[PDB]
Amino acid sequence: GSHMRVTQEEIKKEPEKPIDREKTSPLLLRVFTTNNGRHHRMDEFSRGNVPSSELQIYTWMDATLKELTSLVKEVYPEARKKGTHFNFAIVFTDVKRPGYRVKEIGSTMSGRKGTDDSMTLQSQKFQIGDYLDIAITPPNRAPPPSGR
Description:
Elements: E1 27-34, E2 54-59, H1 65-75, H2 77-80, E3 85-90, E4 103-109, E5 131-137
Parallel strand pairs: 1-5
Antiparallel strand pairs: 1-2, 3-4, 3-5
């Protein structure tokens, strides 16, 4: 027949399907942005503590660091400022994890073509549900940028 059977095995192993950087689909992402550009720790901003901690960004895993520069800056006026130094990292909130996987993969700017900008998220192991911790540094306290 068809309904009744003994052996049950479905082969659906498909290779890695790349997403169209242009025709990609936007997905909800959680990002933690600080107003001092510091990778201190989660204690600075936990998940569900304040609205100024984690922000929603409809980005695409196959997005270039640049796209992330706008996504966050758009959801965070503190970044819209010119000369804003934001560092993209991967950190998780208080959970059943060790607490050492928190590291940065690259940092962009608000109108400044960096080296990581041309880089894509997919390379930083960024996927759906992933935890990205961006460190926004205003131009008022940014010694590197032009000023003094």
